[PDB]
């Protein structure tokens, strides 16, 4: 629906032929996810801003909810110069997602038009909710990592151990290390910092990883990062054949105040696609949909049936959506149900192809006992993780589906969790747990859904 980009046609579309490196899909939306495991004040946001430019966000709410939990995404197109005269990594260039598939060279590289290679999405969180977001479910949250260490400090900083513990627990095999803020660092200082870094990562998953030094503010050696994304990062395997599923992360009401009747639109639901391809005009079911209570106070759920009016990927308009980024499905649902992120925590998929709606879970949890990679300074009990107690509110994080939960009973290691709102899942899924230590939610263990109380979705 937008010019200067590869045409998308539903008729000339086959799910089996679709691959993560397909030019048609990459031309409009990102296909792979590379979470940046860094830290604020160290260039965590600056690196992503330099790589992917500056975004504008098509739809934004007046009030931001769960800003410390939201899994932010940032799309970046990486291109390669076809002229062999231009030396690497200058042939590799990063830019925004709105650029055309080919643009003429802006450098004196003796001609040669740049061609789109890949489209990446940076899974960045203001905290560490990434850990229990992706630590046992797996799904397709990401397949790479960007461990960031600044240069002014000396490795290992007290904020580094948690990052390495996160890299280990995520079971990520593809990690790239970016030494930021090394511009104001002497050569000997940089060398000794690199030596400390390799000593710290000795015997860990970050053994065979690049230690690329970059300067985010001045945009130095970003092309090296793009090159290692091209080469070091392998193509993840994705399943485009199954019925599509999307975990709803955002939700907007796009109708401006004082708009005409003919200009009314449905509810736009942003989210992440796990497995399948969404098509415009496809009948979709959102579960648990409308959750209400009886006169006596009994939970009941009515799944919301609708049709995909349109699909958006950042500023681009799509005809079919594939996993590998934040896709916003504009639908026919009433804006009342999708205003101010009121549909977050729901699963949107093909009709009759959604998991069961649970209100309570019976999980087999393995409780952690010290916070991962934390320095216990003074207070030895601060890093200790207490045992689960009755009437304690945890944070169950099934993949990207966040939900609260009150522990009702623990026998030996089988804990019953009463969710605040019913969620769609299946028996045997890997879930994680979090606890409010102070000012934050911190991972304290994981488990499996042995059993659970389900609720029958009433349909009229």
């Amino acid at each position: 629906g937008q010019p200067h980009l590869s045409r998308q046609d539903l008729t000339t579309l086959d799910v089996t032929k679709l691959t993560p490196l397909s030019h048609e899909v990459i031309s409009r939306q990102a296909t792979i996810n590379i979470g940046t495991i860094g830290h604020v004040a160290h260039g965590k946001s600056t690196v992503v801003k330099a790589i992917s430019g500056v975004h504008t966000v098509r739809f934004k709410n007046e009030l931001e909810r769960n800003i410390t939990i939201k899994l932010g995404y940032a799309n970046a197109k990486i291109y390669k110069l076809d002229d062999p005269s231009c030396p690497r990594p200058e042939c590799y260039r990063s830019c925004g997602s709105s650029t055309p598939d080919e643009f003429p060279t802006d450098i004196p590289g003796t001609k040669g038009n740049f061609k789109l290679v890949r489209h990446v999405s940076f899974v960045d969180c203001p905290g560490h909710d990434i850990l229990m977001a992706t630590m046992l479910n797996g799904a397709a949250v990401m397949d790479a990592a960007l461990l960031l260490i600044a240069g002014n400090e000396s490795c290992p900083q007290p904020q580094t151990s948690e990052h390495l513990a996160a890299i280990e627990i995520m079971k990520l095999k593809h990690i790239l290390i970016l030494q930021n803020k090394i511009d104001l660092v002497k050569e000997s200082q940089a060398k000794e910092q690199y030596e400390q870094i390799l000593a710290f990562v000795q015997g860990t998953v970050a053994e065979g990883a690049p230690i690329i030094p970059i300067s985010a503010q001045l945009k130095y050696n970003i092309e090296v990062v793009c090159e290692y994304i091209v080469k070091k990062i392998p193509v993840p395997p994705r399943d485009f054949t199954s019925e599509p599923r999307l975990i709803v992360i955002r939700s907007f009401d796009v109708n401006k105040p004082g708009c005409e009747v003919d200009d009314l639109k449905g509810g736009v639901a942003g989210g992440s696609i796990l497995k399948g391809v969404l098509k415009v005009g496809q009948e979709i079911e959102v579960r648990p949909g409308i959750v209400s209570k009886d006169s006596e106070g009994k939970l009941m759920c009515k799944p919301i049936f609708s049709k995909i009016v349109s699909l958006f990927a950042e500023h681009n308009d799509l005809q079919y959506a594939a996993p590998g980024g934040l896709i916003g499905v504009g639908t026919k649902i009433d804006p009342t149900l999708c205003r101010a992120d009121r549909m977050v925590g729901q699963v949107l998929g093909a009709v009759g192809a959604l998991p069961e709606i649970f209100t309570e879970l019976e999980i087999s949890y393995f409780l952690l006992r010290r916070l991962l990679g934390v320095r216990t300074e003074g207070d030895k009990k601060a890093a200790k993780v207490q045992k689960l107690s009755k009437n304690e509110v945890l944070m169950v994080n099934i993949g990207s589906l966040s939900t609260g939960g009150r522990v009702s009973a623990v026998k030996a290691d089988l804990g019953k969790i009463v969710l605040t709102n019913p969620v769609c899942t299946e028996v045997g899924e890997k879930i994680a747990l979090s606890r409010r230590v102070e000012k934050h939610w911190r991972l304290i263990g994981w488990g499996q859904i042995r059993r659970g109380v389900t609720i029958k979705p009433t349909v009229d």
Partner: peptide, 24 residues
């Protein structure tokens, strides 16, 4: 400067960056 189809080392990137701020 060379046919580095293989992965580099930290030294070459570091001296590249250092050349960058020393020349400008």
């Amino acid at each position: 400067w060379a046919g580095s189809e293989r992965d580099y080392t930290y030294e070459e990137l570091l001296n590249r960056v250092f050349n960058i701020m020393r020349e400008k």
